[PDB]
Structures are given as C-alpha cells and as structure tokens.
C-alpha cells in the first residue's frame, strides 16, 4: 500500500509504551513514553507530561463508561496513574509496590466495571474508575504481557498472562483455566479473534494460538517489539501486524503465517496501534518508530522452483536406479550419568561414522542448537551428547546426525525426533531413611494404583528392571539439577504423599497428576517447614524495609529542599557579583550532592532488597495456591492475601498448610 499519512516526531519513543486515545472525547491523539520519564501527546503539536519517573507501561481506554473520554494510563515500577488529559485531573494515582510491567484495560468475566489490570513481580491487580482493588491474583514469575481474550467462548473475556517463566496462562476472574508452555520470556500478546491470540517471544518467535495449540509460528532475527492484530487486506479476518527490531512491519495472516503486507523504517518499531486519526469513521494503522517517525495506513514464481526441486529429486532417483549402504539405520538411546547429565547416544549398525550431530531444541540448549563435534582422530560409530535442561518441561530434540565415512566430502543427514520427558533429570534410586525430606503433602486420588504407575512410566524415566505391585509403595528420585530428594508414597487407602523438600516440584507433580486423571477439584494437607520459616523471616523484614525507606526518603526530601534553596541563593550572590558567598554556596552544594548521592546509593540498595522481599511473598502465596487444583486455588490465594493485609501471619501459614 501507501502510507496515508507520515510525520516526524523529535522525541525517542520507548518501544512498548504507545497508545491511541480520544483524550478530547472525540479527537483521537497519540500518547507515547520518552526519555527522562516524560510522556508526550500528539494531538492530530506535541505536549509533554512530566511523569518525572521511568515509565514502564502505557495504555488508553474507557475507564468510566459514563463519559466518552479515553483515560491515559501510565505505569511505573512503583506507581500507576490514570489521567484525564482533557480536564487535567487524576482519576486515580495508586501506589502498587509490586511494579507495573504490563497493563491492559477492559472488562473481565462477571465484573461490571472496566478494570485497569496490571502485572508486577508475581501478582496482578485490578482497579476501577476510582482505584479500588477489585481483582488480585498471583502468577509464576515476572509478568511481561497481558491481553483480554475470550478463551472458552462464554462472552466474558479471560486475561492471558505471559510469565517470565516462559509460560502463558489464562486467568478467569478468579479461576485459572489453562497454561501453555512456550520457550522464552513472552513479550507481547494481542487478541482480535474469538479464541485466537498472537504472541511474541524474545527468541524472535512470532506465533498464533487457538485454544491450546499453535496455528503457525515463525522464528527470525530482530525480535518483535510490538504485535497488534488488524485487517490490512480488509478480508474481514484480522492479521498479525508486527514491528520488528530492525524496522520491518510485516502484516502476516492468522493462517499458516504467510506475509501479506510489508514495510520498512529507519529505526526499530516502537508500536503498531489502530486509531482513526483522519476522522474517517474507519480505523487506521499507525506505526511509530523508536526514533520518532509515525506513519499511518488505511486498509510469485517460487512454485516453479519447487517443481524444479521435484525434478531434481527425480534426477537423483533415476541416477540411483561418499556413498553409504542404504540399510543404515540411526538408533538412539537415552540414559543419565552421575559422575551429571542426561546422555543421548546415537549409533549406526554398520561401519559408517557419525561426522557431526546438530541437536535442535527450543529452551534446553543456549541458542537453538548444540552441535557436537568430534575431531578426525576421535570419530567412531556411536557418539554421546550430554544434555542439561534448565527446568523440568518435556522437550523434543530434533536430531540431525551427519552420517558418512571417514574421508568424505559429502554425506547424508539422518533426521530423528526424540523427546526428553518432563523430569528427564533425577536418576531415581534406592531409599535412604537418613536423608528423607521432612516436608510433605498428602491428598486423595480416585482409584487405580496401576493407572498411577502408568503415570509414573509416562512422566518419569524409569529403568526397564522396574516393576510395581498394587500394594502401597514408595518411589524415590535423586534430582539432577541439585542433589535433592523426592519421595512419592502411594498408600493402599488410595492416598498420595509427596515428600519432596521443593515446593515447586510438589506443585508440578500434583498438577500433572490432576490433569492426568481429569480432576476438577483437589485439596491438600501440606507442610514445608524449611520454606515456611524463611517466608516468615522475609515477612518480618518487609516492615523494617518499609520504615528505613520512609526515613531515607524524608531525609532526602530535606536535603533536596536545602539544595534548591542553595541554588536560589547562589544565583542571587552571582547576580550581585559577590564571589566569596557564591563560591561558599557552590561548596555547600557540592557537599550536599555528595551526601545525597550516598543516601541515594543506600536507598536504592534497600529498595531492591524490598522488591526481592515482595516478590518472595507473592511467589510464596502463588506456590501455596498452585499446589491445589480447582476452586481451592483462588480460595487459598484470597485467603492468604487477606491474612497478609491484616498482618495475621499465623493465619497465613495456617491457610497455606491445610486450608
């Protein structure tokens, strides 16, 4: 197409902080963050707003439907501000203390007020037109992106959270619905379809999701900064507009990801957003660069090359009817070695050799590959690759074993898919009553101990010698990320006792057991003393962190007032060319700046410690909730939140133990 309008804005736009909003009620304008912590507004002249603080989120929407104005939201790692730009007046200036890493604005399920959802360290929040907490839940890790999409087709939109844990979870008003495990820290989600949402990562992977599966996916360089679904070809179905790190804006399709429209810039792409600038009654598509240029749009031979490739294949087969016996089969085998890696051995029942192996896995290896290299003096039939995944998620290696002779210049590439299970580590062994972890969770299951044994064989790497009778039995496992221990005990009464000293491991095991037996509700009797004592320590320390930060901020305000007074006094002494007093003011200013810089260092240090403590508390609440399946989850979450807002720590631990 052709850019229906273009303009150059002299201000650097922060990448993920762009919004279009009719701040005059009927006159759409652009809001975008900038350096120095200032948010600029382009009306059709640029008007600055002094946030005086490093912005981290920015959106714009309708927060009180009584009036027809868009409210400019501005999030900061410790604050959140709604702003009525027309009549400059704060709708609500809330202090989060959890951070603002990703915010949205819409209507959740069974809530009659458009919420300003937010995402911080590990906890989300929600605020109405006045700033009242109406929604709050805890998630796995740092939230990086949020969007509102009606997964499940029931007319009330659930919210999709992209955790730093590489996961995408979908949250209802209170309940969690599903979680799909992507392969890197999410960076952007965008819904415009029914239950389809487009996602981006930090690998560079831009993709599309149905309910719980990926339509398509493309991985490139220049990881996407901002994705937004629009209808460029106006075929009635939205397409994933994307703005990459180089400048390319590629409008793709929500079908198998085929590039439809393409454009380029001079710098990276800050944000792609829809909004009707030109007042034509139809939406537009504005692309805003990092360097501050805005451009707005209104809505062939390769197959012959494939034919030639097919003819080349036919040429190869006719030539047939660096050579290798045609009956060469690559056979793999997984194992685990202590004296500390999951080994994968590949061999060939011939005299042929394996010149190189290029394993391809998404999140296990650093990068996407781990090419194993054997020197010419080391070549042999069977080659072993050591693997060390960083976390327990079932991965699927796509091995490409280069098969050939010793002195060859061309040889085959045999492709083979092998899945490392979820708990690929933990080479399970014999029990040791001296080092059994004192932590324990107990819960109930339906029946069919043999079904649980099949669960073990499906989600664990048991050796072939194993065999389990229907009687109650204990299975132990040594972890291979650390030397920890795990003890699963299946009682004859149909009860289950997980005896791992790690709480995340217990959550994962219980959730997999639930999803394996189609269970909608479960309640646990849990106890993790070592973790609970440390959590109590952090909860104790939080209050003194609060007090120290308060005192430091008071002192620094005092010294800043002193410094402004000295600036005025020095300007006065300089206006009457009295240089002794001017130099004395400048000396005092130097000394005050030194003292204030020391104060800044110590405050920042205590403040980062405070953020660590808050994240610890929120992640602990989430770890408690995540241990129970179904309706008990949000029950425990809200119970712990109320038990911490009232500083009833003992009740917090009581509800985390059994409640």
């Amino acid at each position: 197409l052709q850019p229906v309008f273009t303009l150059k804005l002299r201000h650097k736009i922060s990448p993920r902080m762009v919004a279009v909003g009719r701040y005059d009620g009927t006159h759409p304008c652009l809001a975008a963050a900038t350096q120095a912590g200032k948010v600029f507004i382009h009306n059709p002249d640029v008007s600055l707003l002094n946030i005086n603080q490093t912005v981290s989120c920015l959106t714009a929407g309708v927060l009180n439907p009584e009036l027809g104005y868009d409210a400019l939201l501005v999030g900061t790692q410790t604050n959140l501000l709604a702003y009525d730009v027309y009549n400059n007046s704060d709708l609500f200036y809330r202090e989060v203390a959890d951070g603002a890493s990703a915010i949205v604005l819409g209507t959740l399920g069974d809530i009659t007020s458009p919420l300003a959802i937010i995402g911080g360290n590990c906890a989300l929040q929600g605020f109405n037109h006045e700033g009242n907490d109406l929604f709050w839940t805890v998630t796995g890790d740092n939230v990086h992106s949020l969007a509102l999409c009606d997964f499940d087709g029931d007319g009330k939109k659930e919210l999709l959270v992209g955790s730093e844990d590489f996961d995408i979870r979908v949250f209802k008003e209170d309940e969690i619905v599903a979680e799909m495990s992507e392969t890197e820290i999410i960076t952007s989600l965008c819904p415009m379809y029914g239950s389809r949402f487009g996602y981006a990562l930090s690998n560079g992977t831009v993709g599309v999701y149905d309910k719980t599966a990926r339509y398509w996916r493309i991985k490139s360089k220049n990881q996407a900064m901002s994705i937004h679904a629009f209808d460029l070809n106006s075929d009635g179905v939205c397409e994933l507009i994307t703005g990459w790190s180089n400048g390319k804006v590629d409008a793709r399709s929500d079908r198998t990801g085929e590039v439809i429209f393409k454009d380029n810039f001079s710098s990276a792409i800050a944000g792609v957003v829809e909004g009707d600038y030109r007042m034509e009654g139809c939406q537009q598509l504005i692309c805003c660069s990092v360097d501050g240029e805005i451009r707005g749009y209104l809505p062939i031979r390769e197959l012959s090359q494939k034919k030639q490739n097919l003819l080349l294949e036919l040429r190869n087969y006719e030539e047939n009817a660096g050579v290798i016996p045609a009956n060469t089969k690559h056979h793999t085998a997984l194992s685990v070695s202590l004296g500390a890696h999951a080994e994968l051995c590949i061999s060939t029942s011939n005299d042929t050799i394996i010149r190189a192996v290029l394993i391809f896995a998404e999140g296990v290896f650093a990068g996407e590959s781990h090419v194993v290299h054997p020197s010419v003096h080391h070549l042999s039939s069977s080659v072993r690759i050591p693997i060390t995944p960083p976390k327990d998620i079932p991965v699927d290696l796509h091995l490409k074993t280069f098969v050939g002779y010793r002195s060859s210049t061309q040889f085959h590439v045999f492709e083979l898919t092998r899945q490392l299970p979820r708990f690929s580590m933990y080479a399970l062994t014999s029990p040791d009553p001296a080092s059994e972890p004192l932590s324990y969770v107990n819960f109930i299951i339906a029946e069919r101990a043999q079904r649980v044994v099949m669960w073990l064989n499906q989600n664990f790497l048991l050796p072939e010698d194993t065999n389990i009778q229907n009687a109650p039995f204990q299975v132990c496992f040594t972890s291979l990320r650390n030397g920890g221990q795990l003890y699963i005990k299946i009682k004859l009464s149909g009860e289950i006792t997980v005896n791992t000293d790690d709480i995340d491991l217990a959550g994962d095991i219980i959730q997999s057991m639930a999803s394996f037996f189609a269970i909608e509700d479960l309640q646990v009797e849990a106890d993790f003393p070592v973790y609970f004592e440390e959590l109590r320590k952090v909860l104790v320390k939080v209050d003194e962190y609060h007090s120290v930060h308060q005192k430091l901020s008071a002192d620094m305000a005092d010294n800043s007032n002193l410094i402004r007074s000295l600036l005025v006094q020095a300007e006065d002494a300089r206006l009457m060319r009295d240089m002794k007093t001017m130099k004395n003011r400048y000396k005092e200013l130097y000394d005050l700046n030194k003292d204030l810089l020391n104060g800044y260092k110590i405050r920042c240090n205590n403040h980062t410690e405070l953020l660590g403590s808050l994240k610890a508390v929120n992640q602990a609440i989430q770890r408690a909730g995540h241990l129970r399946v179904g309706k008990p989850k949000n029950q425990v979450i809200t119970a712990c939140r109320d038990a911490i807002r009232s500083n009833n720590i003992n009740m917090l631990f009581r509800i985390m133990r059994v409640g």
Binding site: M579, K583, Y586, L589, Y590
Partner: protein
C-alpha cells in the same frame, strides 16, 4: 544508574569555581586600573588648568 550525571556535575562545578576565581582577579585588576586612571586624570586636569 546515575548515567555519570555526577561526573557532569563535578565538571560543571570545577568550571564555575574557575570562572569565579577569574572574575575575582579581574575585579582586583579593574580596581587597580581605576585607581591609576584616577591619578592620571588628576594630572590631566591639572595640566589643562595650567
């Protein structure tokens, strides 16, 4: 990060102190020159009145 704002502040402070000392010395030189000029113009009025 302070982004080396403190370093720019220190540099500017050094510049300000240097300029203040320069202005002080120029004020002293100007005062000496004014006194010598007063003597000279005294002599010139004397020689015109004679």
């Amino acid at each position: 990060p302070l982004q080396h704002l403190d370093t720019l502040l220190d540099g500017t402070y050094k510049q300000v102190i240097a300029l203040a000392d320069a202005v002080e010395e120029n004020q002293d030189n100007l005062f000496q020159s004014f006194t010598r000029l007063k003597s000279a113009t005294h002599l010139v009025i004397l020689l015109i009145g004679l």
